[PDB]
Amino acid sequence: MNPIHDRTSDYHKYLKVKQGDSDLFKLTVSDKRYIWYNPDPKERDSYECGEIVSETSDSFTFKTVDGQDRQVKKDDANQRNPIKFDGVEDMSELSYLNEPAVFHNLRVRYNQDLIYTYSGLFLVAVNPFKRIPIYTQEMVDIFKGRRRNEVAPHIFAISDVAYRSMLDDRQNQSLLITGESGAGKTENTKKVIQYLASVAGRVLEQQILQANPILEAFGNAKTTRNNNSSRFGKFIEIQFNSAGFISGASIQSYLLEKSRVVFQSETERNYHIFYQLLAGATAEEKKALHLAGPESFNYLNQSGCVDIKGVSDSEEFKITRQAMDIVGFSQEEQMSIFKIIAGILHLGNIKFEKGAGEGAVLKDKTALNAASTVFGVNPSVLEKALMEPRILAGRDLVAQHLNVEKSSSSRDALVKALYGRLFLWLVKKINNVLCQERKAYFIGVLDIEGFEIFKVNSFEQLCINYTNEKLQQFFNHHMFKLEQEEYLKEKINWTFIDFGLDSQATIDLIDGRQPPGILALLDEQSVFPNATDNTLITKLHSHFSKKNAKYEEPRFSKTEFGVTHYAGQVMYEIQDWLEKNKDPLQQDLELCFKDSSDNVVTKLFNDPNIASRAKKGANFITVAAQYKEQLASLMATLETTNPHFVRCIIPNNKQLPAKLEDKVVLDQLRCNGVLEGIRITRKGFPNRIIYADFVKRYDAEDSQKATDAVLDPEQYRFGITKIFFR
């Protein structure tokens, strides 16, 4: 039996809507009509189903749940779809396309663990927050080669469609997986990669998969929104030869959240690797590295959280090391990696105290000595580099004597540099292993850090949210703007629709050059010798307050500014932004570590690709300018691919299964442009081929006549160089 047609198969059990019973059939053939309405008009996302009992020319009257009777204009009415549509696999098929109707369909599917639903040309994936057995090899095998309409919605299906388009069109593809923090981007990314590796595979393929536990160990952490939050964005190029077999892969990582190494908010964790090393190391290795439990380290004992429900850090450590072995990190390199992790922990335990004067001293040198031992550096040199770094004053060489706060910050800067550089080094090592062939093609899978809002939002959140805004605009541009520009250019008699989705004003507020946006004003302040966080916020207010519609100068704070993003307004706290943008590290610290006896540490400080910083005239390039440039480069790459969108949707903000919260979901459906995306797919003309190229596949001087002969008139329209189909 073909599992697709076998109602006993796991495919049918886990990916198809369950058979309705005879009572549902009765309800399904009912002549009655229903409407979605709000019992409480202030709560616009909480809906009940009311029966339409009467109508006028312009209105419906319906019975509420409590049994009263309401009236509503037909043009304002959210009619409920005939219930034969409940659970439908592609929501472009719905008769009534409205918010409660789309949400209801997602809910019916979600309630039976069907997390994937097509919304026209793109896939919607609602996080189940539990394991559903739909990602086995057997599932992979079922989707292999199948057209999207032959099989159930699945991340595997869109992956296969991209793979088939790559071969059929000889064009690079991308899979763009959007979603707010914890929505499921990383999980789905991993599934796309699993699938491509299996269907296009011929050890290389295993190394591709095993890159993930490494990067997640060093790059992921518990935040309040996601127990396994990615703290770096990544674009994975899965590379193929001309025959369509996997030839390699390349990982581009984007800015890692280095600040997490030295500070975590309440209930959050540092990067997983710290907890994995401490829980998972042998008592031998804990002695050589001078390690104890998490509670003995300032960098791990501030949040009040050292464990994650359902996660064994010692077991994860074993998975991380196995991945490192498979990828090819030597035992030497692995030990050096954990020396750096241990050393960072020790550096964090250094306690600076006030000396006779304003300058800091280090009374207890235990932590300094353990760090220096594991890194292979001179402790006296390190001590002097932390508290008495030398700088130029003009051309004179002057020993500073940093006070306690500056010493502690410099120490943090060293830590963040060590961690950030190690991460870049891990990625580079992985890439060199996965770089074995010049590619013919690639499918690029984008997994950015998801849109996030916390009590305190800093520069890191602005960068993340800016990226999410840019990705949403990329969706807007491809689904709506480019689409409609093609229709109108080809004169298929298209009436332009304003879909009301445009993130450009927010993007410009952030990254504008002329007039200067936030990032540009930040950069200018960053190289202005007398700038402070206060002159910076004042500068932002001066440029944007009551001037830019997406900016708010709050009345309740002098140190925050609000950006209205697609996903909601975010208040950003300016504290430390100049320093975060400059990302300073005392040169004496680099000089100390350049002399490291450790082969990995020495690479982190001597390899120009890792250690060197690009210059913009008399200054180093800022974090913001670099960020902006890497993102612009990503977007340019994406523009050369055929994109496929997966919209991950989080069901609630508690990381709980079986708990769709309608306001949480509806906010995402709205700001993602899901309904608008379904509408363009229904009302528009998805596919078009130049007439001459259509005739040759299905020669003539009058290529249009040949096209009409071969051809229902409604499902097509003749353009000036192309035929258009539905």
Which residues from 632-691 bind ligand ADP, rule CB under 6 A?
648
For ligand ALF, the closer of residues 246 and 448 by Cβ is 448
Binding ligand ALF (rule: CB under 6 A), the pick from 50, 87, 343, 450 is 450
For ligand ADP, the closer of residues 309 and 615 by Cβ is 309
Query: How far is residue 51's CA from residue 35's CA, in Å, rounded to a whole number?
Result: 6
Q: Count Cβ neighbours within 10 Å for each residue of 38-75 and write b for 16 or more, e otherwise.
A: eeeeeeebebebbebeeeeeeebbbbeeeeeeeebeee
Q: What is the nearest approach in angstroms of Mg ion to the Cβ of residue 449?
A: 7
Q: What angle do CA 474, 478, 481 make, to 5 degrees?
A: 105
Query: How far is residue 412's CA from residue 106's CA, in Å, rounded to a whole number?
Result: 46
For ligand ALF, the closer of residues 38 and 655 by Cβ is 655
Please tell me whether residue 253 binds ligand ALF under the rule CB under 6 A. Answer: no
**Binding-site residues from annotation for ATP:** 179-186
User: Which regions of 15-143 does DSSP assign to beta strands (E)?
Assistant: 33-37, 48-55, 59-63, 69-73, 78-79, 116-119, 122-126
Please tell me whether residue 270 binds ligand ALF under the rule CB under 6 A. Answer: no
Query: How far is residue 427's CA from residue 431's CA, in Å, rounded to a whole number?
Result: 6
User: Is 46 a residue of the active site?
Assistant: no
Please tell me whether residue 449 binds ligand ALF under the rule CB under 6 A. Answer: yes
DSSP string, 606-657: H-HHHH---EETTEEPPHHHHHHHHHHHHHHHHHTSEEEEEEEE-S-SS--S
User: Is 119 a residue of the active site?
Assistant: no
CB 175 within 8 Å of CB 158: yes
Binding ligand ADP (rule: CB under 6 A), the pick from 450, 517, 673, 719 is 450
481 torsion bin: left (phi>0), alpha (psi -120 to 50), beta (else): alpha
Of 226-234, 273-281, 497-505, 603-611, which segment contacts ligand ALF by CB under 6 A? 226-234
Which residues from 210-269 bind ligand ADP, rule CB under 6 A?
226, 228-230
Please tell me whether residue 725 binds ligand ADP under the rule CB under 6 A. Answer: no
User: Is 9 a residue of the active site?
Assistant: no
DSSP 356: S
For ligand ADP, the closer of residues 185 and 543 by Cβ is 185
For ligand ALF, the closer of residues 216 and 552 by Cβ is 216
Site track for ligand ALF across 173-192, x = CB under 6 A: --------xx--xx------
User: Is 30 a residue of the active site?
Assistant: no
Site track for Mg ion across 213-232, x = CB under 5 A: -----------------x--
Please tell me whether residue 548 binds ligand ALF under the rule CB under 6 A. Answer: no
User: Is 219 a residue of the active site?
Assistant: no
Q: What is the nearest approach in angstroms of Mg ion to the Cβ of residue 447?
A: 6
User: Is 707 a residue of the active site?
Assistant: no
Q: Give the helix ranges, DSSP H, for 170-312.
A: 185-199, 204-219, 272-280, 283-288
Catalytic residue, candidates 220, 224, 226, 503:
226
Q: Give the helix ranges, DSSP H, for 289-364.
A: 313-327, 331-349
Of 69-77, 177-185, 312-320, 685-693, which segment contacts ligand ADP by CB under 6 A? 177-185
Of 65-73, 121-129, 314-322, 504-512, which segment contacts ligand ADP by CB under 6 A? 121-129
- Of 220, 218, 335, the residue nearest 273 (C-alpha): 218
# residues contacting ligand ADP (CB under 6 A): 20
# residues contacting ligand ALF (CB under 6 A): 9
CB 236 within 8 Å of CB 250: yes
User: Is 182 a residue of the active site?
Assistant: yes
Query: How far is residue 236's CA from residue 216's CA, in Å, rounded to a whole number?
Result: 14
What are the structure tokens assigned to 726, written together? 């539905």
**Binding-site residues from annotation:** 179-186
User: Is 247 a residue of the active site?
Assistant: no
Binding ligand ADP (rule: CB under 6 A), the pick from 55, 93, 113, 187 is 187
Q: Are strands 560-565 and 551-552 parallel, antiparallel or unpaired?
A: antiparallel
Please state the length of the chain: 726
Longest pairwise C-alpha distance within the chain? 96
For Mg ion, the closer of residues 230 and 652 by Cβ is 230
Q: Count Cβ neighbours within 10 Å for each residue of 113-137 and write b for 16 or more, e otherwise.
A: bbbbbbbbbbbbbbbbbeeeebbee
Query: How far is residue 221's CA from residue 256's CA, in Å, rounded to a whole number?
Result: 11
Residues in contact with ligand ADP by the rule CB under 6 A: 115, 127-129, 131-132, 179, 181-187, 226, 228-230, 450, 648
Catalytic positions are 181-182, 186, 226, 229-230, 450, 452
Which residues form the interface with ligand ALF (CB under 6 A)?
181-182, 185-186, 226, 229-230, 449-450
